[PDB]
Design a protein around this ligand. Structure first.
Ligand SMILES: CNc1ccc(S(=O)(=O)NC)cc1N
Ligand SMILES: CNc1ccc(S(=O)(=O)NC)cc1N
Lengths: 1724, 263
């Protein structure tokens, strides 16, 4: 709505806060009367009569409650009257509630009932509560109230296993708190700041119930944050459709219907108004309004009124007087004692019975305080905050035990102590607020609470509340305590701030959303109900009945304010709200926006402590602070005393604030009262103010200012300057000692080099030496080492080792200790890099490793520095200078291969009609790269390197090499290795269609099973495989002739040697070159690669002539790429993504408004969220670009086949999305829609960038980091994933170019520009991955000594790259002796590790040989750590549960993905899961594997992505089980060996051991099992034995379901063996027992193992096991594969001449039930 | 005659707080640095001072107390008539407005073992035209005690605080300069025998093509102008590769942070 207005929000603000009195008239109950007295008027209001119970008012007995809820009322017989009237609404419905009742009438037990309903929602059959399945938030206005609430609710709910807790100020420990706290109790402000941050893996999602206690706080200046919370809660309920129950507790005051509306309380169903006759004790009120206006007279008038009113109760009622300072408690109590002394009055409080008086005299002689020494003996007492916990508890006890008759206190006792007195007196209603810099009235909540403390609940029949105030305020307090001060909204006074917080959260993105948001505020309902109060005319409202224009004007005004202060970019035309880092820091640190504008304006990198303190002091929080005349003396003596000079005059309040801060640090106790209040307020704010400054200057990289501001943070927090002894930060040290130590002025750092004796001697206090020593080594201290690894001549990788050098002690350090790692340039003026570091108590003793990149230049700078500073400990830092004097940079890379201007090569060149059929009906010519390499690939046998950007069609070059092979050997074998499995699958499709369907050769795809894989390698002319599938095969090349027979070896995406899985690839390629050097026929090698700076090294390693090495640099992509990189200087992930949302849409409309686009996003959630966001931005667009390029009528056939509501909603508007959670057909059909041209945008998860079958005109890469949830931190996309993603912006047959926009944190922009526009330098990481390869090479007798290992290494890419970039591999020279020494070390370390693990043996230091474990690891291709751990985990007593656990801890499972939650849910079946571990762990990959294994063995078949995780588990479970049985066989034990031999078939068939065999048959149910056990015995053969018609009558099954059952029954093992022993009797002890067992299979093998619950196709494997049962001693084993008839011989060495029998076992790895167990005797 | 009628009270105005407020702004002076560059000795050695350590040196100083650094450097390959200043070493020191007071022990450190000492740099409040007699005496005493200081290779750079800016001039001692300076006990400003023939300007250039670095003391800082008691002409010190803290840093005046707090 374009015509708008800019408002002056100041003229709309109820300035008097909660003292605003909307009403103009006041009506007192019948019986109220006024007395006049000289100087003051008294108004009396009589105590109220309880309303007669009335119609159906019966108090509910606790037994008639729901029984799960009665434990919570344990110790109570009947509920209150209010609790009864509310039992059904609180416990039997989920309605939002609003309960208005007088103070003390029992609302918080109603809150208990609400919490109890929520608790019941989560009770299982075991009786336990799912304590990790919900959260309840209790918002309480006062910290003291919060602490008493945690205590009370904890006690009442402990019988439930429920944790109740409050939230500390620190945020890192707070997440651990929230994780296992069911009921969080906090203030409005703490909950507001927490939900302001938001973030990843938050717990606010479990929150089902929010309680707002004392919701009439709405009327206070704090009220607006209650509005913020409720608006956020309800709007978030809409955008998750998951309800959250809201319960408001309120004093009885006008506008409760409006509050109920604001809470979405159904007035009919959940509003409860209880008038003040429901006060638990009737209250007779006395208001005293003083008329005197001369202060000196008024002070004595008030003390006179206090005395007179106290005398009316002396010796009859203990009276509690509230006063509003810590000094005034004593000042007033002493004034009253002295007025009692002047008269005979003192004897009236203390009885003639000396019990109480002597108790008082004793406790005043036990010296609880000097003021207590004065007051306690007379019967008076004080109670306030500054006292000690023991004194405060003693005062409470002496008052409850009626020893004190006159207790003078502050509001803290009314809030955080249940302590009623018969008579309460409020001595004055005037308080000094430092925020307003002046005197002001008590808040309504304080008044209400204090007068609620009138009348002991069961002792008194009525209570008496006396309130003394100025006369003008009478009608106010009269209103408040008599249900007539209405509750208005203070929202506008905070509108900008509040609005910014919803902008930074993403929840408000434009003025329209803002208006929608403001419709949820309490301000909105109040403006609707009574517009005149909020400034709206009655003609206005009728012009604007929903107040749309008005809300637009308020949002417009706040938006402009935020825009001027630089928190937001407000575009008035569009009305759009762009977030900023300044805005986010103002939201997250709770700073008002004026302040952050001031900071942004004054902060400069050349700032010093002086200007820093001035900048702090200029904060808007301190706006109303003034320098009063009476202060200027005490301030003056401090100004010239503080150690930071103050430029400006003390006449100015900025100077006063500065001085107060410095005094608070130095611990100068002031004398003035205004000074102390202003100092507590200033320093209260200073913490997060300074922390916001520190985040600002850190994230701009200002090194000096960053240091100063973190130091100032820490000084403010520890109340000491760094000049003071760090030991002072140990509170348990006595200050006498640290004074002795500080006096000596000597450096603290020199204490580390002294024993305890010299410690005690240096400080001249020997008896302390030891203790000092202890603390000296408790102080946190870190040692840093650096490995400089050059990437190029301008980018440097750094590995920083952080070894802790201090003893840990939980009472000192807690669970963690946090540091900052700051990489600073030579001048210490710029932070080249920085990151947070968390030393966990888990790892207090372990070295940590940090890796990062830093830019460098030429000439090299002298040095950089790495600082690590404690985030909280003062004076605790380590700086390590990184000198570059000896850095060896790699030589600048060569020029690319010139792309020659050859004429496009026709398909004709193939000179072969059959071959040309593959490409004729696809294109006429080949692209320039293929055209340039064609002759070398096709008309040569040279080894060839093609390096070129992705999408250059390097795959057709491998096809050239294959065609040439096919023209030479009618039975030529080519092996093609690709690093990713999804690439293997795509290439498998394409090359099956080309070379088998067209050219009639055998294309095969290795599966991982070496039986099928060996037969494929024998059968196929093109064999496709991933690296490890080829590694396991080709390790046995000397016993595998097919592996030597290879004519062609193509390896694709070779640059991935640099990535995480590079070592296996490097190793198989090195093996192929070694083999070729041995054979008479050399194996041709062709390698394809992304653009490489160091291609020549790869070629020299793979043996490519210079002239057949084609390294093209990325500017030669056939389809030209236009690459934009957008930096976003927002270091908070969610806010950064928010800030790039509209850029994503604008990028679409700028670079590809009509052609297809792919958006990559970091996670699954983000795909749906960003599809929706693109769509919303498209709707709001006037020149709107629609992405639906087909008809909605054509789309319904494809659409209704999906299961995702939002996905089809978005596809309707032309935008799809792909993530790992969709069904495979969902993904396939969305992909085809994208292919079709039907939809123009698809949002894909980063994890699918290797298996995506679509391409696009425009790729947008949204962020470049994803949140790893097992290290709980963000991780940069590998550069390979980025190159792969950018490759998707490529469509040769359709686009003149591709366009990619990469959006990234600013701190990454430069790196992308360096590594995308130029070719890539790749290195080897085989030195960190050599044990398993070395072990396999020792098993194959390839490496037999250490010299063999050196020579082996020389064949690697590692060894080529060690001479070209030595510092990267930690060498300091490239001489031959350097090389040979470094290699000898590498070899020595790896062989030593293998030898310790009992995998190899080292004889005479030089010779190595393979051992049992090394052989098992090599055979089953298993991490040597996995099998070593297996060895030291398996005993003869381990069962199936222990097996599943042991194999769950395998190294092969560490990389399983992490998501959590539903794992916390699946744990629930651990009581019903036949598996015992007794360990609670979460967020761990091995535990996820354990869970998913049990899930598979009980066919849970519930979740989707977890199902793919289960399939990854099962792709290795069988090899791990077989290695287990080989280990347990080496041990000779019988129980665990055959236990695992059964667990193999269990995991194949997805059955436990209790489940009987019938579940193996298709289309079978548990009812079928009960039937087949009823009518007969339970075997698969017994199903076969059934009469066919009897089978059918017992089945109740379809015909095709019975066809599946028969398919299984024919492929089911049906086999009998024959035990036979040659030389039956003629054997001798220690001699040859040769048992030949033959196996007859009734039918020839039909096909692979029928096992649909298993991902890989298997083939039936068997074990023959001779082992005596009673002895647990295995005699002989053999593993075998059988077709129909197979003879298997076993040999054994007899134990004794004693003629004995042996039990035989024949057990499958696949089919359960087929196992047999015979016996046979043998005589010596 | 107002004794009793008119009565005012003195309020302390401690000296260093103004100087601290002033030193906080020295960074402004580092954008306007000028070298005298008079055509003196076109054939003597030339001295290249990297701008980075000079800006740092200006910024860590005071506007009345002089600070000094030792200069280490090397000649550029196959160009021996150039001395590139590579390092400035800050050692425990105090100063007045006319002189600086250093430990007699010169810096020693492995990092320095490849470089040659090139003399020293110091700040002074005003732009005198001649080299100080205190400077000539200091340089000559140093030379007499340390044979590693070639009178033909070591120089004295004065950095003078011209208003709003910073002017640099570089001198060296003449033979008569060395001989007179080593026998001078008159710490005054007009000592007996002092002569303008005792020094000669050497050419000096401010560069950007390379960067210097700082070495600082290992167990303390360099500034002792608030701890001059604890400074001793005979004090020994080790060094470390780190950048100096500015004159009024907290560790330079721990008295100001402990005294007024504990009392
Ligand atoms: C303040 N929240 C609110 C305000 C007004 C209404 S209304 O439907 O009655 N009129 C616009 C409903 C709600 N929840
Ligand atoms: C210019 N200020 C700034 C610059 C860069 C980043 S960053 O997102 O790239 N992280 C350090 C954050 C900020 N506030």
């Amino acid at each position: 709505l374009a015509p708008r207005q800019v408002l002056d929000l100041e003229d709309l603000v109820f300035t008097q806060g909660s003292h605003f009195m909307a009403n103009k008239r006041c009506q007192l109950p019948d019986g109220s009367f006024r007395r006049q007295r000289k100087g003051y008027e008294e108004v009396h209001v009589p105590a109220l009569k309880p309303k007669p119970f009335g119609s159906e008012e019966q108090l509910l007995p606790v037994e008639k409650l729901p029984k799960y809820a009665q434990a919570g009322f344990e110790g109570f017989k009947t509920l209150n009257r209010i609790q009864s009237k509310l039992y059904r609404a609180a416990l039997e419905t989920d309605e939002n509630l609003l309960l208005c009742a007088p103070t003390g009438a029992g609302k918080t037990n109603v809150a208990l009932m609400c919490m109890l309903r929520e608790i019941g929602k989560h009770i299982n059959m075991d009786g336990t509560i799912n304590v990790d399945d919900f959260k309840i938030i209790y918002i309480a206005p006062m910290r003291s109230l919060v602490q008493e609430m945690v205590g009370s609710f904890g006690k009442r709910l402990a019988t439930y296993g429920i944790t109740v807790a409050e939230l500390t100020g620190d945020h890192q420990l707070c997440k651990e708190e929230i994780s296992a706290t069911q009921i969080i109790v906090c203030t409005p402000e703490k909950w507001d700041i927490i939900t302001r941050k938001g973030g990843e893996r938050t717990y606010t999602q479990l929150v089902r119930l929010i309680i707002l206690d004392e919701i009439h706080l709405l009327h206070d200046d704090r009220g607006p944050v209650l509005e913020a919370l409720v608006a956020r809660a309800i709007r978030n309920i809409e955008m998750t459709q998951e309800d959250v129950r809201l319960i408001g507790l309120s004093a009885t005051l006008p506008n409760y219907e409006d509050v109920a509306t604001f809470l979405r309380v159904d007035p009919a169903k959940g509003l409860f108004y209880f008038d003040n006759s429901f006060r638990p004790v009737p209250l007779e009120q006395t208001y005293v309004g003083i008329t005197e206006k001369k202060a000196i007279k008024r002070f004595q008038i008030m003390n006179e009124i206090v005395y007179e009113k106290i005398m009316e109760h002396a010796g009859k009622n203990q009276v509690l007087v509230f006063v509003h300072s810590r000094k005034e408690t004593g000042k007033t109590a002493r004034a009253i004692r002295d007025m009692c002394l002047e008269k005979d009055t003192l004897g009236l409080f203390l009885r003639e019975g000396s019990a109480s008086t002597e108790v008082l005299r004793t406790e005043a002689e036990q010296c609880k305080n000097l003021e207590l020494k004065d007051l306690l003996p007379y019967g008076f007492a004080i109670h306030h905050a500054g006292m000690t916990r023991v004194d405060r508890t003693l005062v409470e006890d002496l008052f409850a035990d009626k020893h004190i008759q006159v207790l003078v206190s502050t509001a803290t006792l009314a809030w955080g102590v249940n302590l009623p007195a018969h008579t309460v007196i409020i001595k004055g209603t005037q308080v000094y607020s430092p925020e307003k810099g002046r005197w002001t009235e008590l808040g309504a909540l304080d008044i209400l609470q204090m007068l609620g403390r009138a009348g002991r609940p069961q002792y008194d029949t009525k209570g008496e509340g006396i309130l003394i105030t100025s006369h003008g305020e009478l009608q106010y307090y009269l209103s408040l305590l008599n249900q007539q001060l209405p509750i208005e909204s203070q929202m506008v006074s905070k509108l900008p701030d509040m609005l910014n917080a919803e902008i930074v959260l993403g929840n408000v993105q434009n003025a329209k959303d803002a208006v929608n948001w403001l419709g949820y505020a309490y301000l909105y309902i109040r403006m609707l109900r009574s517009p005149t109060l909020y400034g709206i005319s009655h003609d206005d409202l009728k012009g604007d009945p929903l107040l749309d224009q008005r809300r637009l004007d308020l949002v417009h005004t706040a938006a402009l304010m935020l825009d001027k202060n630089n928190l937001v970019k407000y575009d008035k035309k569009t009305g759009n709200f762009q977030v900023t880092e300044l805005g986010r820091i103002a939201s997250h640190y709770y700073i008002t926006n004026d302040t952050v504008q001031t900071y942004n304006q004054l902060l400069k990198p050349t700032l010093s402590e002086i200007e820093l303190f001035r900048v702090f002091s200029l904060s808007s929080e301190f706006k109303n602070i003034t320098v009063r005349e009476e202060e200027k003396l005490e301030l003056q003596k401090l100004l010239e005393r503080v150690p930071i000079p103050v430029k400006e005059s003390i006449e100015e309040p900025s100077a006063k604030i500065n001085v107060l801060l410095q005094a608070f640090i130095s611990q100068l106790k002031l004398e003035g009262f205004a000074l102390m209040a202003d100092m507590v307020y200033v320093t209260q704010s200073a913490g997060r103010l300074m922390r916001a400054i520190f985040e600002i200057v850190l994230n701009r990289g200002w090194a000096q200012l960053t240091d100063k501001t973190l130091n100032l943070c820490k000084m403010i927090d520890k109340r000491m300057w760094q000049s003071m002894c760090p030991l002072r930060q140990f509170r348990k040290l006595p200050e006498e000692v640290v004074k002795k130590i500080e006096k000596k002025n000597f450096p603290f750092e020199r204490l580390y080099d002294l024993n305890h004796n010299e410690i005690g001697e240096l400080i001249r206090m020997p008896k302390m030496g030891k203790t000092i020593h202890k603390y000296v080594h408790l102080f946190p201290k870190l040692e840093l080492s650096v490995h400089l690894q050059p990437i190029t001549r301008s980018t440097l990788k750094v590995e920083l080792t952080i070894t802790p050098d201090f003893q840990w002690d939980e009472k000192v350090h807690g669970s963690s200790e946090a540091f900052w790692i700051l990489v600073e340039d030579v001048d210490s003026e710029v932070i080249l890099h920085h990151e947070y570091f968390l030393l966990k108590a888990k790892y207090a003793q372990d070295e940590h490793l940090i890796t990062f990149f830093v830019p460098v230049f030429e000439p090299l700078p002298p040095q950089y520095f790495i600082r690590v500073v404690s985030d909280r400990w003062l004076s605790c830092e380590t700086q390590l200078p990184v000198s570059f004097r000896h850095l060896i940079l790699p030589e600048k890379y060569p020029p690319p291969t010139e792309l020659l201007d050859l004429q496009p090569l026709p398909v004709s060149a193939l000179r072969n009609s059959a071959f040309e059929s593959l490409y004729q009906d696809k294109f006429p010519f080949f692209n320039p790269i293929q055209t340039q390499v064609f002759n070398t690939v096709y008309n040569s046998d040279d080894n060839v390197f093609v390096g070129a950007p992705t999408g250059s069609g390097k795959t057709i070059c491998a096809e050239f090499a294959i065609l040439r092979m096919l023209l030479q050997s009618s039975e030529g074998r080519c092996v093609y290795i690709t690093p990713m499995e999804a690439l293997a699958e795509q290439v498998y499709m394409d090359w099956y269609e080309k070379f088998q369907d067209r050219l009639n050769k055998k294309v095969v795809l290795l599966t991982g099973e070496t039986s099928t894989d060996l037969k494929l390698l024998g059968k196929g002319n093109i064999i496709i495989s991933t690296p490890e599938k080829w590694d396991i095969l080709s390790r046995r090349w000397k016993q595998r002739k097919n592996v030597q027979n290879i004519n062609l070896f193509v390896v694709d995406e070779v640059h991935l040697i640099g990535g995480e899985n590079g070592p296996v690839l490097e190793v198989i390629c090195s093996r192929m070159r070694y083999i070729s050097s041995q054979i008479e026929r050399p194996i041709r090698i062709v390698a394809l690669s992304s653009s490489l700076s160091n291609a020549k090294d790869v070629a020299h390693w793979l043996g490519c002539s210079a002239t057949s090495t084609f390294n093209f640099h990325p500017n030669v992509r056939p389809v030209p790429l236009e690459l934009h990189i957008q930096g976003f200087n927002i270091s908070h992930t969610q806010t950064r993504l928010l800030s790039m949302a509209k850029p994503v849409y604008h990028a679409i409309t700028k670079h590809s408004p009509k052609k297809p686009v792919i958006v990559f996003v970091p996670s699954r959630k983000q795909t749906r969220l960003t599809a929706i966001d693109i769509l919303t931005t498209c709707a709001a667009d006037i020149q709107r670009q629609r992405f639906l390029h087909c008809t909605e009528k054509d789309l319904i056939p494809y659409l209704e086949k999906l299961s995702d509501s939002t996905l089809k909603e978005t596809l309707l508007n032309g935008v799809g999305y792909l993530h790992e959670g969709l069904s495979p057909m969902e993904r396939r059909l969305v992909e085809q829609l994208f292919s079709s041209g039907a939809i123009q945008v698809v949002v894909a998860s980063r994890s699918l960038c290797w298996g995506m079958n679509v391409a696009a005109h425009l790729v947008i890469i949204m962020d470049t980091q994803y949140y790893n949830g097992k290290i709980h931190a963000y991780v940069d996309y590998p550069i390979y994933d980025v190159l792969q993603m950018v490759g998707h912006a490529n469509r040769p047959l359709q686009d003149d170019e591709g366009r990619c926009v990469i959006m990234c944190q600013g701190s990454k922009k430069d790196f992308f520009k360096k590594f995308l526009y130029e070719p890539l330098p790749v290195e080897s990481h085989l030195d960190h991955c050599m044990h398993d390869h070395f072990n396999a090479e020792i098993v194959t007798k390839t490496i037999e000594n250490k010299q063999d290992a050196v020579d082996y290494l020389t064949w690697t890419f590692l060894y080529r790259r060690m001479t070209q970039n030595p510092n990267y591999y930690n060498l300091q020279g490239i001489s031959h002796r350097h090389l040979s020494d470094h290699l000898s070390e590498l070899v020595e370390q790896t062989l030593s590790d293998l030898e310790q693990s009992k995998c190899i043996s080292i004889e005479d230091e030089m010779d190595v040989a393979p051992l049992n474990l090394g052989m098992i690891a090599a055979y089953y291709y298993i991490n040597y750590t996995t099998i070593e751990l297996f060895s030291m985990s398996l005993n003869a007593k381990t069962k199936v549960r222990g097996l599943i656990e042991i194999i769950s801890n395998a190294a092969e499972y560490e990389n399983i993905p992490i998501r959590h939650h539903e794992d916390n849910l699946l744990r629930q079946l651990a009581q019903k899961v036949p598996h015992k571990l007794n360990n609670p762990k979460f967020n761990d990959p091995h535990v996820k594997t354990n869970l998913l294994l049990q899930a598979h063995l009980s066919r849970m078949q519930l979740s989707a992505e977890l199902q793919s995780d289960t399939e990854e588990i099962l792709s290795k479970a069988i090899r791990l089980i077989q290695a287990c049985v080989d280990v347990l066989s080496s041990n000779g034990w019988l129980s665990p060996a055959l236990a695992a031999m059964e667990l193999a078939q269990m995991v194949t068939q997805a059955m436990w051991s209790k489940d009987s065999y019938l579940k193996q048959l298709p289309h079978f149910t548990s009812e079928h099992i009960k039937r087949c056990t009823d009518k007969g015995v339970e075997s698969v053969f017994d199903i076969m034995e059934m009469e066919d018609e009897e089978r059918n009558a017992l089945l109740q099954l379809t015909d095709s379901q019975i066809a599946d059952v028969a398919r299984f029954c024919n492929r089911y093992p049906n086999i009998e063996l024959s035990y036979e022993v040659v030389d039956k009797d003629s054997i001798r002890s220690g001699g040859p027992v040769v048992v030949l067992v033959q196996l007859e299979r009734e039918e020839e093998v039909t096909g692979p193992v029928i096992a649909p619950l298993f991902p890989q196709k298997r083939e039936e494997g068997w074990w023959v096991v001779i082992g005596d049962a009673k002895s647990n001693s295995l005699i002989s084993i053999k593993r075998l594969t059988l077709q129909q008839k197979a003879k298997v011989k076993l040999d054994f060495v007899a134990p004794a001449t004693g003629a004995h029998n042996y039990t035989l076992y024949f057990m499958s790895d696949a089919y359960m039930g087929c196992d047999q167990e015979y016996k046979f005797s043998v005589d010596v | 005659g107002p004794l009793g009628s008119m009565t005012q009270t003195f309020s302390s105005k401690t000296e260093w707080r103004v100087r601290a407020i002033s030193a906080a702004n020295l960074h402004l002076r580092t954008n306007h640095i000028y070298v005298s560059s008079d055509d003196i000795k076109e054939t003597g050695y030339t001295y290249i001072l990297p701008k980075n350590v000079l800006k740092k040196f200006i910024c860590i100083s005071d506007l009345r107390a002089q600070i000094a650094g030792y200069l280490y450097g090397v000649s550029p390959p196959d160009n021996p008539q150039v001395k590139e200043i590579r390092c400035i070493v800050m050692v425990p020191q105090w100063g007045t407005h006319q002189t600086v007071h250093l430990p007699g022990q010169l810096p020693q450190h492995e990092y320095l073992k490849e470089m040659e000492p090139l003399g020293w740099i110091h700040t002074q409040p005003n732009e005198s035209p001649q080299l100080s007699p205190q400077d000539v005496t200091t340089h000559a005493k140093i030379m007499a005690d340390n044979p590693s200081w070639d009178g033909e290779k070591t120089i004295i750079i004065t950095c003078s605080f011209t208003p709003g800016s910073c002017t640099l001039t570089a001198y060296k001692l003449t033979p008569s300069g060395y001989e007179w300076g080593r026998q001078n006990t008159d710490k005054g400003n007009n000592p007996k025998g002092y002569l303008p023939s005792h020094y000669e300007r050497v050419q000096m250039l401010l560069s950007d093509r390379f960067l210097g670095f700082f070495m600082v003391p290992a167990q303390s800082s360099w500034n002792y102008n608030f701890m001059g008691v604890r400074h001793d002409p005979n004090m020994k010190y080790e060094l470390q590769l780190a950048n100096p803290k500015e004159f009024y840093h907290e560790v330079h005046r721990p008295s100001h942070f402990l005294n007024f707090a504990l009392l």
